[PDB]
Amino acid sequence: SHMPLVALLDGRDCTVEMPILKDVATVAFCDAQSTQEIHEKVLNEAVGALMYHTITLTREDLEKFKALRIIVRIGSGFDNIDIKSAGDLGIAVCNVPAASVEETADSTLCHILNLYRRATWLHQALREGTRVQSVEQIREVASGAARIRGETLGIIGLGRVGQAVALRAKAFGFNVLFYDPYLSDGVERALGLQRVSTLQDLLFHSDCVTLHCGLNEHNHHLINDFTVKQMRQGAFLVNTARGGLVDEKALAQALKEGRIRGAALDVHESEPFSFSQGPLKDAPNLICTPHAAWYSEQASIEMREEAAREIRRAITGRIPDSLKNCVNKDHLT
Amino acid sequence: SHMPLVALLDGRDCTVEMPILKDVATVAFCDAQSTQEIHEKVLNEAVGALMYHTITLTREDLEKFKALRIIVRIGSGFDNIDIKSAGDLGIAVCNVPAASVEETADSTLCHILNLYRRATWLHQALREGTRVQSVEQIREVASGAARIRGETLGIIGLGRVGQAVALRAKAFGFNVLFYDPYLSDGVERALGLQRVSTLQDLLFHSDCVTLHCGLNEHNHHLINDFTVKQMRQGAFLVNTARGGLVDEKALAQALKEGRIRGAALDVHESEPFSFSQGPLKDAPNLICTPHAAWYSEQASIEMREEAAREIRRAITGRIPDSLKNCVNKDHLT
Amino acid sequence: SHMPLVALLDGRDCTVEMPILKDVATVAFCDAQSTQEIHEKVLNEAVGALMYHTITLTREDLEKFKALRIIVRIGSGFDNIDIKSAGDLGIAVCNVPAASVEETADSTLCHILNLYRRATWLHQALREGTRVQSVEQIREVASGAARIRGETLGIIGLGRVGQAVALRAKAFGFNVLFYDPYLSDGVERALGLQRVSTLQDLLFHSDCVTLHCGLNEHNHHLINDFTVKQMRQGAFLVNTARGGLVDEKALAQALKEGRIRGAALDVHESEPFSFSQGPLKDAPNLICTPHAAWYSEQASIEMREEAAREIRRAITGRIPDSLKNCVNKDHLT
Amino acid sequence: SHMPLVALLDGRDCTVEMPILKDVATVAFCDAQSTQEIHEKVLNEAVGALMYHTITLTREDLEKFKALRIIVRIGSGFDNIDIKSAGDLGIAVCNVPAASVEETADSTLCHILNLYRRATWLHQALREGTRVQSVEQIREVASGAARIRGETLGIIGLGRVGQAVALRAKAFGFNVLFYDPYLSDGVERALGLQRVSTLQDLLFHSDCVTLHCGLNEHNHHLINDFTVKQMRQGAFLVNTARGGLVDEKALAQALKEGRIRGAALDVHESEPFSFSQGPLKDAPNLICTPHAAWYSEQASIEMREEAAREIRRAITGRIPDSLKNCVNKDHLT
C-alpha cells in the first residue's frame, strides 16, 4: 500500500505531473532554493526528484539523500547538477532536451534583432519621453542600428538550438559561422554552414556572437578578459545558454569602453538578475531577460509531462535501461 | 552662371547630396514642418525639392510653388504628397523604393518576435525591479509568450517588404497568408504562400496580423472598429507601414478589452508619437518605435544618394523620361 | 433556345470543360494544327475559342473568324497569338498564368540537376551497356559532373517561374543572379537575390543560364551567335520557356565546339522536336523533353477548369470587365 | 632508408595521394577486385591501405595481411569492411565522411525530380522516336508526372546526406518525414521536420521513400517483401545509400505489379549493375546510375587528399589518437 516518494525540489506547482504519477508515486514539493530548505523526510525517503535550474546539487547535497535513485531536470541544461558524483552515488540523472528548442531560438533571434534594430531601446526612449520629430532625430535616437545582410553571425555550439538559430539567421542574410569542437566533420556541409576550428577564429570573423553551448567543466568564463579582446571592435554578444559562460566583469568593461557595442543576456552568472546589483550594474547598451527564453505555455506543459513520464519509467522499470534521456549512464554504478 | 535651386524641405542635413548635385543645382534647406515655414525664395524659385515624411503637401501647398518641376521622396512611401494634384500642376513626383526593404522587414520580425517572446516587456519588468527567482515567477512574468510554430501570420500587402517578411516568417514555422487585392494570381505559387481574397478572410485566420501596404485613398483606417471585430480573439497587430491604416481609437479599446493581446507600432496616425498623448495614452500591451524601421546607416546613405541622382537626372535631362522612379507619370501634364 | 458556340481549336478532349460550360455554350472541337483545318461553321459562328500552344493565330487567321469575341489560352504563354491584331479586331485574349508555375520550376531544377549530376546521361550509358566496375571508370563515365555549391545560376526573366526557380536554386548552394529589364528596382532585395542590368552581365557571370521570360517582339533569338559568345566557357543552358528564344544553329555549334558543355531544352524553335531533324540533329550533350515541363494531372485539370470559367464569364458578362486574366485590354476596341 | 608500404587495393591512380605521402610511405597499387588479386608482397609488408567500395574485406581477407595497421576508405561508407574483426586484429579503419555530402544530396534530388517530372523517361521516349505533337499526346507520354507540393517525402536515416536532402526537399513543397532510430529526440525540432518512430509509420505516410542510412548488421534488406507491402500504393523509391538495403526480388515484383510506380537506384545488391542481368532485368519504371551520386571533380580530389593525410597521420603519429575519422576505436586492441 506504500508508494515511492517523489519530490519537486525547487518548485511548488505539481498539477501537470499529478495525472501521470498518481498511481505510481506520492508527490511532494519543497519550494526550496537550496539543499538547506529540504525537509528531512524528503532527504531520507525520496526515491525520485524533479527540479528546474534554480537549485544546485553538489556531491555534498547528493550525499544527504539516502534513498534517491533518479533526478529529472525539467529542462535541457543540467550544469546545476554534479553529474559524475551522482553517477558514483548510484543516482541516474535525466533531462528534457527538446521541449524548448524553437522557443529558445526564437528568443535568440529576438535579441539579435533587438540589437541590430534597437527596437527595445527605441521603445525605452519613447517611454522616457524622448521626442523624435525630425529625420535627423530619428537617425540620432536610432544611432547604431545596422543593416543585417552581409553581417557575420558566429554560433558557439551547434546543437539543437544552435542549428535552429543558424537556419533562422540565414533568412535575414546573415553569413553564419559556427565553432563546436565536439562535432565530427560534415555537419557544416549538410546544413550549408561555414565552420571554424578555434574559438579565436569564430570571434575574429563575427560581427555578432551568440552562445548556444552547454556549460561544462572546460568552458566556464569562455568569454573572458582574454577572449573578449579577440572579438571584433563593436561586435554584439548574445547569451541564451548559461551565464557561467561569460565573465561579466570583462563584459561590463567592454560595454563601457565600447569594444562591444551591445549585449543581450537571458542568463547570468548570478540569477535572479538585477540591474542594481552585480558587475553589470552600470553597463550600457545592455538588454536582459529573466531566464525566459525557454518559456511558452506549450513548452512548459510538454517538458513537465515528459519529466513525469521519465519518473514513472524509472519507478516502474529498470534503471537506466527504461530511461529515454539519461545523461550519465557512463557514470552510473 | 545661374543654377537651378533645389530645396530640402523637412530637413537640414544635405551633406550626402552635395557631392552629387554640386555642379548641377544650388542646394538649400528649410528645416520646415509645414508649408508655412518655407522661405518665399524657395516657393518662388525652387525647381526641385527633396523631402522625407514629416511634411505634407496638399494641392494648396503645391500651388504655392511657382517654378517647382520635380519632388523626390527620400523614401518609399509617398502618401504625404497629393500625387494627382502634383501631376495636374505639372510636377513630377518620385520615390526611393528599395533602400530600406530588408531593414523594414527585419524591424517587423523584431516586433513580431517581441510580441510572441515578450523580450521587450521582460526587459522593462527587470528595469522596473521585478524579481524573478522561481520558475512559477518566470511563467508569471512571461505570461502570454507563445510558441510560434503552427501560428498563422497574415500579411496585408505583399510587396517588397511583405515578401521579405513572408520569407523570414517561414523560417520560424509561421503559416503565412497574405491579402493583396492588386496582384495578379500566381505570385502565391512562386513564393509558396497561401493567398486569400478578402481582408475579412485574412483577419479571420491570422493569429498575428502585420501591415505592409501603402496608404492610399481606399484603405484609410483599414483596421477600424468594424474590421477589428473580424480579428481572432487575442491576436497580435504589427504596423510598420503607415499609421493612417489603423484607427487608434478602435485599437486602444481592443487592447484594453483584451480582444487584441498586443500591438507593435512603428508608425502612428499623428507623429511624433507620445505615450502621454493620443488615443493610445493608456493602452496596455503596446510596443512603439519612432518611425525607425527604415533606418540603417547604409540605407540612409543609399536613399539620399539615389534621391540626389534622381534630382540631377530631372534637371539634366527630360521629365519624366529620364526619371527612374517617377510614381505619377499617368497624372503628369 | 440557341446557345453561343465555343471551339477547342487544337485539341479534342473537352471533358473537363463540359460541366462548367454545359448550360452556357455549345462546345465543339477541331483537333486542328492550323487555321486551314477549322470547319467553316467554326470560323463563321464561333463566339469563343479555347486553344493550347500547338496552333498559331496571325492577323490573317484572326480575320477568318466572323463572330469570335474571346480567345482563352489554356496555359500561361500566349506568344502563339497575334495579341495586338486580336485587340484591333475586337477579340479579347486571356491566359491561365498560375496553374503550372511550380511544375515548371520543378522541371527546370530537374534539368539543371540532370546537367550538373548527369543522371540522365548516366542512365543512358547503362542502357547502352557500358560497364562501370572501377572507380576510374565511374570518374570516366560521369566526367563533367560538377559540385553545385558556389556555382552561379543566371535567371533570365524573374516572374512566376523565375522566382520559384530562384528560391529552389538557393537551397542547393547556387549563387543566383537574374536579368529582367521590366521589373522595378527592389524585387532583388525582397527575395535576397543579386540583379544585373544587361543580358551581357548575366551571361558573363553565370555558370548555368536558364530562360524564364516570355517570347515577345524584342527577344526572338535572345541567345544567338552574338550573345552565345558572351557566355562562360563550358556553361550550361536550360530553356523551359520558349524555343523561339534560342537560335538552335548557334546552340548546335556551341555544343559541338564545347563552348557550351551541355543544354537541356523542353521547348524548341520547331515543335514537335526530333533528334533526327533540325539544327540539333547531331548536337552532343543535349537533353530534351517534349514541351512537358507544365504537365501534372492537377495542373492540367486546374488550367482547363479555369479556362472554362473564363469562357463562361465572357459569355455571361461584359468583355473585358468580367475577365480575370485578359492580357490585351490595352488593344481591345 | 626503408619506408613503410601503402597499397591502393582497388584502384591504380595514386596521383592525388603522391605529393602528400612521398616522404612518408612507398605507394603501390593493386587494381584488385578481390583479395585473390593482391600481390604477396602487399599482403606481407603493407602497413597501410587505401580502398574504395569495389572490394570487400572479411575477417578471412584481413587475416592474410601480416603488417597492416590502418585501412582508410576513400569515402564515407565502410560496410564493405569487417570493422569489428579489423579492430580485433589490431587494424584501425577510417573513412572520409564529408567530401560528397552535397553531391550525393543533389544526385538524390535529381532522381526524386526525375521520378516526379519524368524528365529522364521523357528524354528516352524522344530518343526512341516518339512523336509528341498534340497536348493529348503530351499528357500521354508524360503520364504519371505529378505535382510535388503536398507530397510527403520519407527519409530513412537523417545524417549528413539525409539532412541535406531534407532541406532541399522543403524548397519544393515536400512534407518531410524521417525515421532514424539512433538519434536522440530534438533533432526534428532544430531542423523543423516531422519524425516517426517505426519504419512502418515512415512507409505508411510517404509518397516517396528515399534511403540515406548506412548498411549495418541490422538493416540488410530493410526494404523487403514484408516492408514493401507497408508502402503507399504507387509510391516512389530512391536509393543512393547502399544496394544491400533493398531486396531487388521484392522490388522488381512491386514495379511489375504497379504497387511501386517507379524507382531510382544509384546502388545495387550486385555492382556493377546491368539492365540485362539481375532481379531487375525486366523491371519497368526503373532509373539507374552506376554508383556515381558521390562524384564531382572537387569531391574526388577532396576525399583522396584527406585519405592520404589520414595515412600520413597514422604512420607519423600514434594509432588511434592521431586519427581524425577512425570508425572502430571501440574494437581496436
Ligand SMILES: NC(=O)C1=CN([C@@H]2O[C@H](COP(=O)(O)OP(=O)(O)OC[C@H]3O[C@@H](n4cnc5c(N)ncnc54)[C@H](O)[C@@H]3O)[C@@H](O)[C@H]2O)C=CC1
Ligand atoms: N535560457 C533558457 O531558458 C534555455 C537555455 N538553454 C541552454 O542553451 C544551451 C544549448 O542548448 P541545446 O542546444 O539544447 O544543447 P545541445 O546539447 O543540443 O547542444 C550543445 C552543443 O554545444 C556544444 N559545445 C559544448 N561545449 C562547447 C564549447 N566549449 N565550445 C563550442 N561548443 C560547445 C556541444 O558540442 C553541443 O553540440 C544549453 O546550455 C542550455 O542550457 C536551452 C534552452 C532554454
Ligand SMILES: NC(=O)C1=CN([C@@H]2O[C@H](COP(=O)(O)OP(=O)(O)OC[C@H]3O[C@@H](n4cnc5c(N)ncnc54)[C@H](O)[C@@H]3O)[C@@H](O)[C@H]2O)C=CC1
Ligand atoms: N516605417 C518605415 O520607416 C517604413 C515604412 N514603409 C511602409 O511600408 C509599406 C510597404 O512598403 P513597400 O513594401 O516598399 O511598398 P510596395 O509598393 O513594394 O508594396 C505595397 C503593396 O501593398 C499592396 N496594397 C495596397 N493597398 C492595399 C490594401 N488595401 N490591402 C492589401 N494590400 C494593399 C499593393 O498591392 C502592393 O503590392 C509602405 O506603406 C511604406 O510606406 C516602408 C519602408 C520603411
Ligand SMILES: NC(=O)C1=CN([C@@H]2O[C@H](COP(=O)(O)OP(=O)(O)OC[C@H]3O[C@@H](n4cnc5c(N)ncnc54)[C@H](O)[C@@H]3O)[C@@H](O)[C@H]2O)C=CC1
Ligand atoms: N514548357 C512549358 O510547358 C511552360 C513554359 N512556360 C514559359 O515560361 C516562361 C515564363 O513563364 P511565367 O514565369 O509564367 O511568365 P511571367 O509573365 O510570370 O514572367 C515573365 C518574366 O520575364 C520577363 N522578361 C520578358 N522579356 C524579357 C527579356 N528580354 N529579358 C529578361 N526578362 C524578360 C518579364 O519581365 C517577366 O517578369 C513563359 O514564356 C512561358 O511560356 C511556362 C510554364 C510552362
Ligand SMILES: NC(=O)C1=CN([C@@H]2O[C@H](COP(=O)(O)OP(=O)(O)OC[C@H]3O[C@@H](n4cnc5c(N)ncnc54)[C@H](O)[C@@H]3O)[C@@H](O)[C@H]2O)C=CC1
Ligand atoms: N552512392 C554514393 O556514391 C554515396 C553513398 N552514400 C551512402 O549514403 C548513406 C548515408 O551517408 P551519410 O549521410 O554520410 O551517413 P551518416 O553516417 O552521416 O548518416 C547515416 C544515418 O543513418 C542512420 N541509420 C542507420 N541505420 C538505420 C536504420 N536501420 N533506419 C534508419 N536510419 C538508420 C544513422 O542513425 C545515421 O544518422 C551511407 O550508407 C553511404 O554509404 C554516401 C555518399 C555517396
Ligand SMILES: [Ca+2]
Ligand atoms: Ca559593425
Ligand SMILES: [Ca+2]
Ligand atoms: Ca493565440
Ligand SMILES: [Ca+2]
Ligand atoms: Ca565550370
Ligand SMILES: [Ca+2]
Ligand atoms: Ca500518388
